[PDB]
């Protein structure tokens, strides 16, 4: 009976190209975004008109 050793680097190469969220600080800080947004220019006005 033998163990399969470690498996850290075996799975390091298993997620090649997968999205990464390395940063920490008790909050996972992602490194990818594709957020769609709508901009409402109703109640904004130029500062230098008067």
């Amino acid at each position, epitope marked *: 009976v033998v163990v399969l050793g470690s498996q850290e680097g075996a799975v390091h190469t298993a997620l090649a190209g997968a999205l990464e969220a390395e*940063m*920490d*600080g*008790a909050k996972g800080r992602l490194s990818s975004g594709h957020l769609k947004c709508r901009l409402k220019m109703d109640k904004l006005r130029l500062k230098g008109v008067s």
Partner: antibody, heavy 124, light 117 residues
């Protein structure tokens, strides 16, 4: 990132000296080498060493090689300095400062944010 | 070796241009060294004043104005801390700093700049 220094008022010679530094506004272990710099009575600034934020590696001074030991603990977001076998000439004003090691902007390779600073003498 | 040196005292009348040099050791080439300047008011925790490497690679303190300039004379390797509009509040102790091959902080002696009156 406003660092505050806290430490005992006085230590006798040849006795362990410990300063505690709370960063209070930035999470350690993200990077940003944290160090300790001193100015004994009124002379120039002398540095002692810094510890890596993320990895935790410690880089010290060649003259203060066997006496100091810098510690780190991100649970309460603090890092400390231990000065063993102090001498009478070690009376100084200490400052725990920040520094960047890998960034692409060389301005932050210097000590950007400084601490308040503590004064410690080695008299009887 | 690798120690910086500069005079203990300098002074100039308010209004003139004060040049604070910083002579590096012989084993350094100032033309490729990121110079770091610290300003220390007498008892208030010296702050980062001006980092200079080139006239196009420079960055000042968070609130210091453009009166503070930097330059390098590569003939005798010596950085400069130029203060053009000398006000009475420019009276402080100024330091310079570089790094060795192993990236150990190398500070300078620094000049206690005094604004006259």
């Amino acid at each position: 990132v406003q660092l505050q220094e806290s430490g005992p008022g006085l230590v006798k010679p040849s006795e362990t000296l410990s300063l505690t530094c709370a960063v209070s506004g930035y999470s350690i272990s993200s990077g940003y080498y944290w160090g300790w710099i001193r100015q004994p009575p009124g002379k120039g600034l002398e540095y002692i060493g810094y510890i890596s934020g993320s990895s935790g590696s410690t880089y010290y001074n060649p003259s203060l090689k066997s006496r100091v030991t810098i510690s780190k603990d991100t649970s309460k977001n603090q890092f400390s300095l231990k000065l063993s076998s102090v001498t009478a000439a070690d009376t100084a004003v200490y400052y725990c400062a920040r520094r960047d090691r890998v960034g692409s902007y060389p301005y932050y390779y210097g000590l950007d944010s400084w601490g308040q600073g503590v004064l410690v003498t080695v008299s009887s | 070796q690798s120690v910086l040196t500069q005079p203990p005292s300098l002074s100039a009348s308010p209004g003139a241009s004060a040049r604070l040099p910083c002579t590096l050791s012989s084993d350094l080439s100032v033309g490729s060294k990121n110079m770091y300047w610290y300003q220390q008011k007498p008892g208030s925790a010296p702050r980062l004043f001006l980092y200079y490497y080139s006239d196009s690679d420079k960055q000042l303190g968070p609130g210091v104005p453009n009166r503070v300039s930097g330059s390098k004379e590569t003939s005798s390797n010596t950085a400069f801390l130029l203060i053009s509009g000398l006000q009475p509040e420019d009276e402080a102790d100024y330091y310079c700093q570089v790094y060795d091959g192993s990236a150990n902080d190398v500070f300078g002696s620094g000049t206690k700049l005094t604004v006259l009156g």
